[PDB]
Structure formats: structure tokens, C-alpha cells
């Protein structure tokens, strides 16, 4: 359900609904590392959209502290397909 292709410079975004909860482990405590997404998931009309519900993005997506500790930020683009 995850895109997981090696990413790049595009910054993942979150919608107003879930702003501030992890994209991997969907958690409500301590954000750590900025989310990067693949270029295909940010191409064209997809730029700036929510990495969970493809809707309008209002904030930067983050991996939680527990995910970065477990290096779950190094597994590829976390855009849900």
C-alpha cells in the first residue's frame, strides 16, 4: 500500500485532517525527521498534496521519533497508493 520507490527533494505534505501524526506508525507523539517523497508522487497536479489522502496539504509530513530511531525513514517514499 506504500509507494516505496527511492525518493528525492520533494517534501511530503499532510492535510488538515491528520496534521502532526506519523505516516508510518500513525502516532500522536514527538515528530522528528521531515518526509521526502518520490518524484512521480509529486509530479504535475500531485505537488503539495497529502501523503495519506491525496487531498490539499497544509503542513509538512514528519516521521515520528520512534520511526527515525528504527530507521523507518530510510525505506522509500511513504505515499499511500
Amino acid at each position: 500500500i506504500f509507494c516505496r520507490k527511492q525518493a528525492g527533494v520533494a517534501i511530503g505534505r499532510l492535510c488538515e485532517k491528520c496534521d502532526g501524526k506519523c505516516v508510518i506508525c500513525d502516532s500522536y507523539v514527538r515528530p522528528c525527521t521531515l518526509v521526502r517523497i518520490c518524484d512521480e508522487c509529486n509530479y504535475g497536479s500531485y505537488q503539495g498534496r497529502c501523503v495519506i489522502c491525496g487531498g490539499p496539504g497544509v503542513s509538512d509530513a514528519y516521521y515520528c521519533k520512534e520511526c527515525t530511531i528504527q530507521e523507518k525513514d530510510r525505506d522509500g517514499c511513504p505515499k499511500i497508493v
Binding site: 488538515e16 507523539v29 497536479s45
Partner: protein, 815 residues
Amino acid sequence: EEQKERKIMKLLLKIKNGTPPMRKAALRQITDKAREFGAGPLFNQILPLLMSPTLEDQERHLLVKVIDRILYKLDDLVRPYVHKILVVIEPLLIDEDYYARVEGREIISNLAKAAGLATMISTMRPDIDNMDEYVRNTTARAFAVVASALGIPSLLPFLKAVCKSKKSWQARHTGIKIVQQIAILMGCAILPHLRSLVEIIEHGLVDEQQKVRTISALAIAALAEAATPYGIESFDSVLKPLWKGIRQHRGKGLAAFLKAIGYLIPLMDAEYANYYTREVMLILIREFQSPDEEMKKIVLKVVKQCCGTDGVEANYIKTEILPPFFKHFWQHRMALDRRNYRQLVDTTVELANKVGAAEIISRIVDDLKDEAEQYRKMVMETIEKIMGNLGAADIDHKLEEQLIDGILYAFQEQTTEDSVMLNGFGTVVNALGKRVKPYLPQICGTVLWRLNNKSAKVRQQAADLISRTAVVMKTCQEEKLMGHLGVVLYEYLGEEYPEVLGSILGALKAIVNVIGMHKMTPPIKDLLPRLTPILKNRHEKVQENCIDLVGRIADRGAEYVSAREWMRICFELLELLKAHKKAIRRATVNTFGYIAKAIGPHDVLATLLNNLKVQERQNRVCTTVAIAIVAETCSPFTVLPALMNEYRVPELNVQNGVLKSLSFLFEYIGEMGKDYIYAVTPLLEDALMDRDLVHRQTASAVVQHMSLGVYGFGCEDSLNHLLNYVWPNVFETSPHVIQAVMGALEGLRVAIGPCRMLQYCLQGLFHPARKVRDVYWKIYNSIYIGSQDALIAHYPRIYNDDKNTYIRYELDYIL
């Protein structure tokens, strides 16, 4: 059969309205099919579908990729059709859509790579001499794309030949336009070929035709813009003609030559930059009086470009440039001119960034009082930009007085609520700081008059101003009529407009967040009971500001309110933890922490346990969060005994609630849990020995959160002890239990280390039963994907057999 291949190459519909897997499958198969299909039918059908009037964006992208792949394979068979393809795709290069242009350029690039240079030149040469100006532009852009694809030196001979043509001036014009489009398209990649292009195009500046001279000057400007901050010894044979032309030409050609001069000047040294500026400067001063509203924009751009270099110093600028600039450009005619207004503001700011803020600021600050408000907003914008970029070190008594009087008069003379005057007032007062003591009475009178009435759109702007200036307002030991303002803001607490109520609450909070409760004149005991009914309002700004205010009051003025009301307020705040705006939740967490720190953990904890016992799911989850907050603000040594005493109650769904609360507690406190792992270990043992699936699933969740919470703190003993009870659950078929067990194992991989996990997996990796092998290889792959490097030091020794060598001998070396 002919339509044979057509019916089978409907693969492009297989792709167009098709699934991604069959998309790529048909892509690969049609790539293998292309050489045999032949370019004739393929293009005969695809170019109509690409010419479809309502095609989509990504359908177009996929079609372009199909073109790319079917063009790579069939290389030299595309020649007899090139012309046709071009007439379809020579448009899409002047299209107002950026991605259409990218796709057209990619198509033309792959076409030029498939075919040869001679073919492209032979098909594109007849339209070089065309009279329709619409064709000569697409032709130049396509030649630029071909040069970018096949390289510049491959096209250099054709260029050198075409702009020496004595046959017609149209061919020369189009060749110079090709050079200009090459520059525009390739940018800083033209630097190795700069001198070649310059010597190819340089003889056009002295042509007998005026259109050739203009296009040559535009091409020189394009090359100089692509080359910057390098490239200057390649622009040497153009310096003499360009300056002689700006000395002799007049009009459109003069504008082109001046644009060229302006793009060339920043590439020189101080000498040449200083010497050349003088010449073009006398010419530009003469041209300050010409008519077209294009000429003004070009002159402003050139002034900004030249005044930003080192060869030009502030003395010459203030002596020669500032008087005519401010005499000719600063009139309200410039203000109603929306085209060059921003250009004038930027040019003036960048002038002040070199000559000094004082002169600019004076010359326009006398103009802040004006009959037209457009000219007022322009001056205010420029002034606040200069102030933000430089600050206000050089404000004099006279200048300070004038500034204050001007901003005060501008504030009152305001028709519609604008952010311009608000931000100007704010930054001026914030930059002056402790220096504005008597204009503090004056400003307080002004904001009192604005906040008294007039539709609450002036009142909310006054409240914003108070919120942003209260720091410097109190910074000078003046609060008193500070209290006079707070009284009026209090009276303005019943408002039908929530937007104005938000600003009122913000201003009140900014006041009290710097006004001591002793001397905060409205007695805290009276305010707070007036404040508690506002907590049930449903506007987000009102709610956030009310919660923040109650939090400040509970943090500092806790003594005045009799408790019980604090308990009611916290029990009401309990429901805001589920708010669907992070802000509301953040402020609620803060305020709950303050109230808990104020009234003490005992009573609130008793109430929270009672509330956790009797309510529905979401309220119980919020109660769990609240218990974790109380235990973090007041050390968990005050919460843990009362919470563990509740586990001694004999009922199911009661122990599971205690376990869920412990799970979230450890996840929420993180590092603080290092002192409390020994206390909860026997309870987790009991729960891990519990038959109920939820009891073991929740105990595994607790183990995971506890493991990831303490890491680097030396708690490995209890975690190994608990792993001894978690591990037997690996043979569980229930999905939720096994999910929690995997989570706990991956947390222990971090807290306990991969060596222990490998030691637990070794004997099962090669078990005779396939179930054991599946489970153990899943666990092992999870251990291997994380920390693959550490495992190098942990693998056990495996002896050589007759066929193969398995000992790692390097690690047996002994220095």
C-alpha cells in the same frame, strides 16, 4: 494485411484507458513491435490521437513516452515522415502551458536524435525564409531544441552560413533569432561556445537593415544574461558598436541597445564598469524624459542593475542619480500605474541598500502626508521595506517626531481596514523600542479611540495592534492606563462577531501575559467566573485564547480562585483533547498541565480514575491521555501507586483498561520511565501469564513502548526478563496478538540489542517443522533489515565441510 497491424497496435488504447500493469506490459511489447510495425502506420494513427482536442495531461505524458520509446528503436526509418511530425509538433513550443512545452521539446529532441542533422536541416530550411512571422518563431525554437539535443558545434556551420546570407534579411534575422533562442533555452551551458556564437552574430549590429540590428542586440543581451558572472572576454568586439549605437540611435533600437548595455555592465571590472557606466549614464539621464511605459520599466531595471555593482559608489549616486530619480519618478501618476509600481519600490529599496537609509527615507517621508492614499501606501511600503532590511539606527529627534506624527495621522485617516498601516505601526514602534515614551500616551489615546467603536473591524485591527505592541508598551514601566485599556477590553467580551472576539481575547492575553496579577487591577476572582462560560464557545480562536488565558491564570493566580472551579474547568477541558485542530489540542495539553500543577495530583487523579471507570471509548482514551499528562507534570511517583491500587480490583475490562493506560503512559513519558520499570514488571509478568488475548496483546504493547522509551539508560535486565515472557507467544495465530508481539520484538531489538535477538532465533532458523522455520525467518529478516552491520560481530562459528570453506579467517588474526 494492413489493418492487421492497426487492430493489433490498438495497444495504445490498451495503454490509454488501461491498468498500470497492462500499461507497462503493452509498452514493452509495442517497443519490441515498433521496428516491424513500421513508422508509417504508427505515426499515421498516433499523431491524430496526440492532436486530439481534449486529451488529458498525463495521457499526453504517456503518449510522449510511447513516442520516445518507439523512436529510439526505429532510428533511420523516421526520415521520410519528419516534416509531417514537425507540422504537428512545431506548435506546443509557444504554448502557454509549461508542461506542453516540455513535452514538445522532448519529442523534438528524440526525433532529432532518431533522425540525423542533415535531415532536420533539410526539412527546416525552407521555412527559414518564410514571410509569416508565426512560422519563423517556431522554426527558431525548434532549431534551438535541435542544437540542445545534437550539440552546438554540430549546428555552428549552418548558423555561420545562414546569418551571412546576402539573399534576404529574413534569413539573417532568423539565424540571429536561432542564436538568441539557443541562449534562452540552454542558459549557462553556452559558456564554452560563447565566443563562437558572438563572432557568428556580431556583424549584425552594423547592418543596413534596422530589424537585423535590433535582433542582434537582443541576441547579445540574451547571451550576456546566460553567461553571468562569467563570459566577459567574449564580449569585446561588441563594446564599440553598442556604445556608438546608444550614442546615435533613438527609439526601439535604442531601448534594445540599452538593455544589452545593462546586461553587459555587471560582467566588467571596476575600471571598465566605472568608465562604461559614465557613458551609458549620460545617455540614460537624457532618456529619463522619454514617453513609453515600457521605457520606464527598462530604465528602472537598468538603474537597479548598475547601482548594485562595486564600480559605482554612493558618492556618485547621491550626487548625480538621486535628484532626477526622485524628481521624475515619485509622483502619484507612478502610484496609479500598477505596472511599474512594484519595480519602483524594489529599485528604491535596492538604492537605499547602498546609498544609506536616511536620504531615501527623508525624501519620501515628507510625502507620507498626501491627498492621494495610493501614494501614501506606496511610501509606507517602501519605508517599511527599508526599515526591515536596515532597521532604524539613524532616526533623529526630528525624524522620530515626524515619523510618529505621520504614522499617527495615517492610522486615523483610514477608510478600509488594511494590513499595511497595521504592520507599519507595529514595526515602527518595535524598532523604536524604549525610546517612544510620550508618544506612548499619544498612541494609547489613538488605539483607545479606534477600539471604542466603529464596526469591530477597526476594533479587531486595534486589538491586533495592541497584541503586537504590548511588549514595548509595558517595557517602559507604563501599565496603568494599560489597566485602563484592559478594563475596556474586558467590557468588550460579549461580541456577536467571533473574528473580533478572537482579537479581543488575544489582546487581553498579551496584556495579562506581561501584567502582574498583583497590579492586574480587575480582581482575578471576578474575572475567571466571567471567563468560564466562554470555554463552551465553538469558535476555534475564541476557544484557544480562552484556554490560554485560563491556563495563565491557573499558573500564576491560582491562590485567588477557590479550587472546585479548577476541577470543573479541567473536567470540561477533558473533552477538548479530541479536537480535530492540533492548535486546540496543544493549548489544551498546556492548560491541563498548568491546572494539574496548580491544584495537586491527588484529587484530579481520583476523579480521572472514576471517569475512566464509567464512560464510552473516546472519553476513556482522553482520560488516559489526561492521566499521562498529570503523571508527567507531577512526577509519576505521585500517580503510580494510586493507579496500581486500581489493578487490584477483581473485574475483567478493568485490568485491560489499566493495561491500556500503562501502555499510553509509557509511550507518552518516554525517557522519564527509566525509574519505574521495576515497579510494573510483576504486573506485566502476571498479564503475560494471563489467558485473555487482550491481556497479552496489551502487555506486549506496553513492553514495546517501555523498550523504545528507555534506550541508552541501562535497563537491560528487566527487558531481558520480560522478553523471557514475551517470546513464547511467537506461535500465536491471532493477527492482533502476533502484530503486538512483532512490535515488542522490534522495540527490544533497539533497547536490548541485535545479538540477543539472534541468540533467540538461532536454534529455530533450521527447525524440522515448517511453521517454526516460517516464524523464525520472519523474525530474523526483521532483525536483519535493521542493523545488518552489527550482526557481523555476532554470527556463530561454522566449521568447514569437505566441499566448502566457512571459517572467517581474518577475524582469527592476532596482532
